Design a protein around this ligand. Structure first.
Ligand SMILES: [Mg+2]
Ligand SMILES: [Mg+2]
Length: 109
RNA sequence: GUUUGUAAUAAUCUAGAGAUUUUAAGGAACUAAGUACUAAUUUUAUAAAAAACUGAAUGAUUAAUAUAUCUUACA
C-alpha cells in the first residue's frame, strides 16, 4: 500500500458508509519539545476507534493513523482459509454460500 | 639629552719629556623626539564547506488533486 492524501480518503470512506466524520484525537504523547517525540493519535468516527498511528510529529502521526484506518478497511478478511468457488467443481461438496462482494475502492480528491 | 672628556690643525712657551690658548673640544654602544633616506615591494599566495530535530507563534508564493476514456483540434 502506498497512500496519497490518506486523510482525504478516510474522510470520503466515512462519508460513503454514512459514518460520523473522522476526528483525530491525541491518545498519548511524550517528548514534545525534544528531538524524538512520540505522538500517539487515534482517529474516531463518533465513539468508535478506527485507526491509530504513532509518529514523531503531529501531522505524521495523524497521517499514519489514517493510513492504518484505511488498511484495516481494505485488509478485511472473512477467514484465513476461506472457501473458493472452484471447490464446487469437485463433486461431493457442500452447498455454496454467497461470498462478500465489495462496492469498490474509495475515489477521493 | 646622557656619557666620556678637552681631538687635530694653528699660535705661544719649553734642555725636553711637556704646558697654555682656540676648547664644555672632539667622540659615543645608549635614550627621547622628529624625518619616509633604506627595507616592510610585483600583476586575482594559502586555509576556512558554511544554518539539525520537535512543539509553539507569525508571514510570502504556488495545483499542493483525483477518476473515466482514447482520441482531440487544426489544416
Ligand atoms: Mg650630561
Ligand atoms: Mg532546523
Amino acid at each position: 500500500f502506498e497512500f496519497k492524501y490518506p486523510t482525504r480518503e478516510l474522510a470520503a470512506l466515512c462519508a460513503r458508509e454514512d459514518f460520523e466524520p473522522p476526528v483525530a484525537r491525541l491518545l498519548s504523547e511524550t517528548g514534545r519539545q525534544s528531538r524524538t517525540p512520540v505522538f500517539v493519535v487515534g482517529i474516531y468516527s463518533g465513539s468508535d476507534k478506527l485507526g491509530e498511528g504513532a509518529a514523531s510529529s503531529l501531522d505524521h502521526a495523524r497521517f499514519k493513523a489514517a493510513m492504518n484506518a484505511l488498511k484495516a478497511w481494505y485488509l478485511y478478511s472473512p477467514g484465513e482459509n476461506p472457501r473458493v468457488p472452484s471447490d464446487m467443481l469437485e463433486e461431493g461438496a457442500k452447498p455454496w454460500t454467497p461470498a462478500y462482494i465489495d462496492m469498490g475502492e474509495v475515489i477521493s480528491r
